[PDB]
Design an enzyme around this catalytic site. Structure first.
Site, PDB file in Angstrom:
ATOM      1  N   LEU A 149      61.414  68.696   9.933  1.00  0.00           N
ATOM      2  CA  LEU A 149      62.489  68.188  10.834  1.00  0.00           C
ATOM      3  C   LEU A 149      61.850  67.778  12.157  1.00  0.00           C
ATOM      4  CD1 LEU A 149      65.397  67.595  11.777  1.00  0.00           C
ATOM      5  CD2 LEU A 149      65.490  70.095  12.365  1.00  0.00           C
ATOM      6  N   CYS A 150      62.125  66.548  12.586  1.00  0.00           N
ATOM      7  CA  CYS A 150      61.461  66.048  13.847  1.00  0.00           C
ATOM      8  C   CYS A 150      62.287  64.896  14.459  1.00  0.00           C
ATOM      9  CB  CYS A 150      60.129  65.542  13.506  1.00  0.00           C
ATOM     10  SG  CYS A 150      59.210  64.971  14.940  1.00  0.00           S
ATOM     11  N   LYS A 176      70.213  64.669  21.999  1.00  0.00           N
ATOM     12  CA  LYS A 176      71.260  63.688  21.820  1.00  0.00           C
ATOM     13  C   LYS A 176      72.068  64.010  20.547  1.00  0.00           C
ATOM     14  CE  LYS A 176      68.620  60.261  24.308  1.00  0.00           C
ATOM     15  NZ  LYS A 176      69.458  60.359  25.532  1.00  0.00           N
ATOM     16  N   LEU A 215      54.524  75.244   4.108  1.00  0.00           N
ATOM     17  CA  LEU A 215      53.406  74.410   4.640  1.00  0.00           C
ATOM     18  C   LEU A 215      53.760  73.838   6.022  1.00  0.00           C
ATOM     19  CD1 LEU A 215      52.689  72.593   1.251  1.00  0.00           C
ATOM     20  CD2 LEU A 215      51.550  74.576   2.236  1.00  0.00           C
TER      21      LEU A 215
HETATM   22  C1  MYA Z   1      72.067  72.750   0.407  1.00  0.00           C
HETATM   23  C2  MYA Z   1      71.032  71.850   1.162  1.00  0.00           C
HETATM   24  C3  MYA Z   1      71.029  72.247   2.694  1.00  0.00           C
HETATM   25  C4  MYA Z   1      69.830  71.522   3.359  1.00  0.00           C
HETATM   26  C5  MYA Z   1      69.750  71.807   4.886  1.00  0.00           C
HETATM   27  C6  MYA Z   1      69.481  73.233   5.229  1.00  0.00           C
HETATM   28  C7  MYA Z   1      69.370  73.405   6.763  1.00  0.00           C
HETATM   29  C8  MYA Z   1      68.055  72.828   7.345  1.00  0.00           C
HETATM   30  C9  MYA Z   1      68.014  73.153   8.844  1.00  0.00           C
HETATM   31  C10 MYA Z   1      66.753  72.561   9.473  1.00  0.00           C
HETATM   32  C11 MYA Z   1      65.515  73.453   9.227  1.00  0.00           C
HETATM   33  C12 MYA Z   1      64.312  72.723   9.855  1.00  0.00           C
HETATM   34  C13 MYA Z   1      63.035  73.454   9.554  1.00  0.00           C
HETATM   35  C14 MYA Z   1      61.906  72.946  10.473  1.00  0.00           C
HETATM   36  O1  MYA Z   1      61.432  71.842  10.199  1.00  0.00           O
HETATM   37  S1  MYA Z   1      61.444  73.857  11.839  1.00  0.00           S
HETATM   38  C15 MYA Z   1      60.475  72.658  12.822  1.00  0.00           C
HETATM   39  C16 MYA Z   1      61.504  71.853  13.601  1.00  0.00           C
HETATM   40  N1  MYA Z   1      60.785  70.776  14.358  1.00  0.00           N
HETATM   41  C17 MYA Z   1      60.343  70.943  15.567  1.00  0.00           C
HETATM   42  O2  MYA Z   1      60.404  71.965  16.304  1.00  0.00           O
HETATM   43  C18 MYA Z   1      59.622  69.707  16.119  1.00  0.00           C
HETATM   44  C19 MYA Z   1      59.819  69.457  17.655  1.00  0.00           C
HETATM   45  N2  MYA Z   1      61.218  69.470  18.034  1.00  0.00           N
HETATM   46  C20 MYA Z   1      62.081  68.543  17.612  1.00  0.00           C
HETATM   47  O3  MYA Z   1      61.756  67.595  16.911  1.00  0.00           O
HETATM   48  C21 MYA Z   1      63.499  68.722  18.023  1.00  0.00           C
HETATM   49  O4  MYA Z   1      63.566  69.485  19.201  1.00  0.00           O
HETATM   50  C22 MYA Z   1      64.465  69.216  16.932  1.00  0.00           C
HETATM   51  C23 MYA Z   1      64.563  68.232  15.764  1.00  0.00           C
HETATM   52  C24 MYA Z   1      63.989  70.567  16.336  1.00  0.00           C
HETATM   53  C25 MYA Z   1      65.838  69.416  17.573  1.00  0.00           C
HETATM   54  O5  MYA Z   1      66.316  68.208  18.024  1.00  0.00           O
HETATM   55  P1  MYA Z   1      66.823  68.185  19.591  1.00  0.00           P
HETATM   56  O6  MYA Z   1      66.063  69.186  20.394  1.00  0.00           O
HETATM   57  O7  MYA Z   1      66.850  66.782  19.918  1.00  0.00           O
HETATM   58  O8  MYA Z   1      68.272  68.806  19.560  1.00  0.00           O
HETATM   59  P2  MYA Z   1      69.633  68.016  19.099  1.00  0.00           P
HETATM   60  O9  MYA Z   1      70.482  67.843  20.398  1.00  0.00           O
HETATM   61  O10 MYA Z   1      69.411  66.847  18.267  1.00  0.00           O
HETATM   62  O11 MYA Z   1      70.343  69.195  18.334  1.00  0.00           O
HETATM   63  C26 MYA Z   1      70.625  70.517  18.785  1.00  0.00           C
HETATM   64  C27 MYA Z   1      71.124  71.383  17.687  1.00  0.00           C
HETATM   65  O12 MYA Z   1      69.916  71.554  16.851  1.00  0.00           O
HETATM   66  C28 MYA Z   1      69.741  72.925  16.637  1.00  0.00           C
HETATM   67  N3  MYA Z   1      68.277  73.163  16.388  1.00  0.00           N
HETATM   68  C29 MYA Z   1      67.256  73.162  17.264  1.00  0.00           C
HETATM   69  N4  MYA Z   1      66.094  73.382  16.660  1.00  0.00           N
HETATM   70  C30 MYA Z   1      66.359  73.558  15.356  1.00  0.00           C
HETATM   71  C31 MYA Z   1      65.553  73.787  14.210  1.00  0.00           C
HETATM   72  N5  MYA Z   1      64.228  73.969  14.176  1.00  0.00           N
HETATM   73  N6  MYA Z   1      66.196  73.881  13.035  1.00  0.00           N
HETATM   74  C32 MYA Z   1      67.519  73.738  12.875  1.00  0.00           C
HETATM   75  N7  MYA Z   1      68.301  73.528  13.940  1.00  0.00           N
HETATM   76  C33 MYA Z   1      67.732  73.411  15.171  1.00  0.00           C
HETATM   77  C34 MYA Z   1      70.145  73.579  17.965  1.00  0.00           C
HETATM   78  O13 MYA Z   1      70.335  74.973  17.836  1.00  0.00           O
HETATM   79  C35 MYA Z   1      71.415  72.737  18.175  1.00  0.00           C
HETATM   80  O14 MYA Z   1      72.500  73.223  17.381  1.00  0.00           O
HETATM   81  P3  MYA Z   1      73.635  74.136  18.068  1.00  0.00           P
HETATM   82  O15 MYA Z   1      72.903  75.358  18.674  1.00  0.00           O
HETATM   83  O16 MYA Z   1      74.321  73.252  19.145  1.00  0.00           O
HETATM   84  O17 MYA Z   1      74.545  74.693  16.997  1.00  0.00           O
HETATM   85  C1  F5Q Z   2      57.357  75.203   7.574  1.00  0.00           C
HETATM   86  N1  F5Q Z   2      56.890  75.161   9.014  1.00  0.00           N
HETATM   87  C2  F5Q Z   2      58.140  74.968   9.788  1.00  0.00           C
HETATM   88  C3  F5Q Z   2      57.725  74.902  11.260  1.00  0.00           C
HETATM   89  C4  F5Q Z   2      57.313  76.311  11.665  1.00  0.00           C
HETATM   90  C5  F5Q Z   2      57.071  76.098  13.142  1.00  0.00           C
HETATM   91  C6  F5Q Z   2      55.728  76.469  13.676  1.00  0.00           C
HETATM   92  C7  F5Q Z   2      55.888  77.874  14.189  1.00  0.00           C
HETATM   93  C8  F5Q Z   2      55.399  78.041  15.618  1.00  0.00           C
HETATM   94  C9  F5Q Z   2      53.945  78.612  15.848  1.00  0.00           C
HETATM   95  C10 F5Q Z   2      52.862  78.573  14.951  1.00  0.00           C
HETATM   96  C11 F5Q Z   2      51.670  79.219  15.246  1.00  0.00           C
HETATM   97  C12 F5Q Z   2      51.452  79.789  16.511  1.00  0.00           C
HETATM   98  S1  F5Q Z   2      50.012  80.399  16.992  1.00  0.00           S
HETATM   99  O1  F5Q Z   2      50.159  81.684  17.732  1.00  0.00           O
HETATM  100  O2  F5Q Z   2      49.250  80.586  15.749  1.00  0.00           O
HETATM  101  N2  F5Q Z   2      49.219  79.319  18.019  1.00  0.00           N
HETATM  102  C13 F5Q Z   2      48.518  78.143  17.528  1.00  0.00           C
HETATM  103  C14 F5Q Z   2      47.187  78.244  17.136  1.00  0.00           C
HETATM  104  N3  F5Q Z   2      46.418  79.381  17.401  1.00  0.00           N
HETATM  105  C15 F5Q Z   2      46.662  80.082  18.701  1.00  0.00           C
HETATM  106  C16 F5Q Z   2      45.285  80.695  19.109  1.00  0.00           C
HETATM  107  C17 F5Q Z   2      44.414  80.539  17.842  1.00  0.00           C
HETATM  108  C18 F5Q Z   2      44.961  79.331  17.129  1.00  0.00           C
HETATM  109  C19 F5Q Z   2      46.526  77.153  16.503  1.00  0.00           C
HETATM  110  C20 F5Q Z   2      47.186  75.957  16.271  1.00  0.00           C
HETATM  111  C21 F5Q Z   2      48.531  75.846  16.627  1.00  0.00           C
HETATM  112  N4  F5Q Z   2      49.164  74.700  16.424  1.00  0.00           N
HETATM  113  C22 F5Q Z   2      50.481  74.498  16.755  1.00  0.00           C
HETATM  114  C23 F5Q Z   2      51.197  75.537  17.375  1.00  0.00           C
HETATM  115  C24 F5Q Z   2      50.587  76.726  17.579  1.00  0.00           C
HETATM  116  C25 F5Q Z   2      49.215  76.946  17.240  1.00  0.00           C
HETATM  117  C26 F5Q Z   2      52.498  79.730  17.464  1.00  0.00           C
HETATM  118  C27 F5Q Z   2      53.702  79.151  17.098  1.00  0.00           C
HETATM  119  C28 F5Q Z   2      55.990  76.432  10.929  1.00  0.00           C
HETATM  120  C29 F5Q Z   2      56.029  76.267   9.422  1.00  0.00           C
END
Ligand code: MYA
Ligand code: F5Q
Length: 411
Positions: free
Chosen positions: A159-160, A168, A411
């Site tokens: 998710l990104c 937004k 992953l």
């Molecule tokens: C049956 C099939 C079902 C399939 C779907 C199952 C569900 C899958 C769910 C997804 C699992 C993903 C697994 C991964 O990939 S976890 C990795 C997620 N990606 C990142 O952290 C990358 C960097 N950040 C971003 O790209 C953005 O900040 C994201 C996209 C995360 C939010 O975009 P933005 O910052 O522009 O915000 P918005 O205004 O559009 O939206 C705000 C709303 O979003 C809720 N929010 C924030 N972060 C997350 C998050 N990680 N999971 C779920 N929800 C999240 C937040 O509480 C708020 O909702 P509410 O608090 O108002 O209620």
């Molecule tokens: C499926 N999918 C969904 C997304 C989920 C979100 C990631 C979790 C956050 C999350 C992941 C991991 C950490 S960490 O404490 O290991 N810090 C980081 C490290 N190390 C820190 C010192 C040694 C190397 C090295 C490289 C990194 N690169 C990116 C971010 C952190 C990193 C801290 C935070 C991870 C897995």
């Protein structure tokens, strides 16, 4: 307030989750025909796009979006830099559904602005052992066991939203549209992990890392420093001495996995994973896909004794952009993947993982405390990171469990 999550079929508070006893669905049962045929409405300046993961240019677009906009740590020292080859591996496992990869592009110029990916997974996600116990004492075994059979569900990742488009409310629309496409396939549960707290995890664990190239690692945070090392004379020499590893694996019998090892690896992994409360079930095709060595991406070794596979480990590569530090701009990290040990203690098996990673040029090994990963932290000099990985289900009530009862590596 969670304006989005309050509307979804997930437990809403830790308290609610603390009340849960049996696994099962949250929502009313629904049928595919109840689900809208048409994509969720979006602004006329945007369009939905289903990338073709067989197209180099579509994988590159995804790659660039994530390279610049995906997950950072809390202090913005690192951002993950999944490679194109890695993305093609992760997004295209056996029997993947192309429709579950969901992107939003700007209509005018086809700029990718947002992405969410679903892959199929067959998961054991019935009631945990510790509750199946409360259920017996009390007389309710059949109910506690109703959902024991592995389920074919969705795993959500990547998710990104582009940094220009943050806050937004785009993430809820992505999540709604993925949910619609998965439900159109008669799938009603998902599993996902995040480093942020949302309603409501069934498990959470710390990250742990093991320095392989300490000169580089300490430099990113930034010599002096570590606090404890300044206190003596040749501190870089002491750091290198502390983390040094052998040049070659210690386990005679260790070698790279090959295609004919697939059945044996499948068997010893499945016997191990079965012991955990939540865990994946893999076919031979899924073992071949997720474990056979792929250059730059996934590295897998078996211990073979008298032509029998008795142990194995795997790790996969995710480099991270190093954000501010000018000198080094990439950190090459190896992540512990699946493994099974039957002939040697787990720490001896994983020491070989660290030797191999180190010899292949990785700077650090990282993992979460799932599986039996706690059992080698101290002896192999891992230290806790600042991250915590939270595990979630969508539309699945599940009791809280420890991360050492989780066998799913995401992953
Ligand atoms: C049956 C099939 C079902 C399939 C779907 C199952 C569900 C899958 C769910 C997804 C699992 C993903 C697994 C991964 O990939 S976890 C990795 C997620 N990606 C990142 O952290 C990358 C960097 N950040 C971003 O790209 C953005 O900040 C994201 C996209 C995360 C939010 O975009 P933005 O910052 O522009 O915000 P918005 O205004 O559009 O939206 C705000 C709303 O979003 C809720 N929010 C924030 N972060 C997350 C998050 N990680 N999971 C779920 N929800 C999240 C937040 O509480 C708020 O909702 P509410 O608090 O108002 O209620
Ligand atoms: C499926 N999918 C969904 C997304 C989920 C979100 C990631 C979790 C956050 C999350 C992941 C991991 C950490 S960490 O404490 O290991 N810090 C980081 C490290 N190390 C820190 C010192 C040694 C190397 C090295 C490289 C990194 N690169 C990116 C971010 C952190 C990193 C801290 C935070 C991870 C897995």
């Amino acid at each position: 307030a969670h304006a989005f999550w309050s509307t979804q079929p997930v437990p809403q508070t830790e308290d609610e989750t603390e009340k849960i006893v049996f696994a099962g669905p949250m929502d009313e049962p629904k049928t595919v025909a109840d689900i809208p045929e048409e994509p969720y409405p979006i602004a006329s300046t945007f369009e939905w796009w289903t990338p073709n993961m067989e197209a180099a240019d579509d994988i590159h677009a995804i790659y660039e979006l994530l390279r610049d906009n995906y997950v950072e740590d809390d202090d913005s020292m690192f951002r993950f830099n999944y490679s194109e080859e890695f993305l093609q591996w992760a997004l295209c496992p056996p029997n993947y559904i192309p429709d579950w990869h969901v992107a939003v592009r700007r209509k005018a110029d086809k700029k990718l602005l947002a992405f969410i990916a679903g892959v199929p997974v067959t998961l054991r996600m019935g009631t945990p052992k510790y509750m199946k116990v409360k259920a017996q004492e009390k007389g309710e075994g059949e109910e506690a066991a109703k959902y024991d059979e592995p389920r074919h569900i969705c795993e959500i990742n990547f998710l990104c939203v582009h940094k220009q488009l943050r806050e937004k409310r785009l993430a809820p629309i992505l999540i709604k549209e993925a949910t619609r496409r998965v439900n159109r396939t008669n799938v009603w549960q998902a599993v996902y992990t995040a480093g942020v707290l949302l309603p409501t995890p069934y498990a959470s664990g710390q990250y742990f890392h093991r320095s392989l190239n300490p000169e580089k690692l300490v430099e990113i945070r930034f010599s002096g420093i570590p606090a404890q090392y300044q206190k003596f004379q040749n501190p870089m020499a002491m750091l290198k001495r502390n983390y040094q590893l052998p040049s070659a694996p210690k386990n005679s019998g260790l070698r790279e996995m090959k295609p004919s090892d697939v059945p044996q690896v499948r068997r010893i992994l499945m016997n191990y994973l079965d012991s955990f409360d939540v865990g994946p079930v893999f076919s031979d095709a899924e073992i071949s896909h997720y474990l056979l060595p792929r250059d730059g991406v996934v590295f897998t070794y078996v211990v073979e004794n008298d032509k029998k596979v008795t142990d194995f480990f795997s790790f996969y590569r995710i480099p991270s952009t190093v954000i501010g530090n000018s000198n080094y701009n990439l950190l090459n990290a190896a992540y512990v993947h699946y493994y099974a040990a039957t002939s040697i203690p787990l720490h001896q098996l994983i020491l070989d993982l660290l030797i191999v990673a180190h010899s292949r040029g990785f700077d650090v090994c990282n993992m979460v405390e799932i599986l039996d990963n706690r059992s080698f932290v101290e002896q192999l000099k891992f230290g806790a990171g600042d991250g915590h990985l939270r595990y979630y289900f969508y539309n699945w009530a599940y009791p809280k469990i420890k991360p050492s009862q989780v066998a799913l590596v995401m992953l």
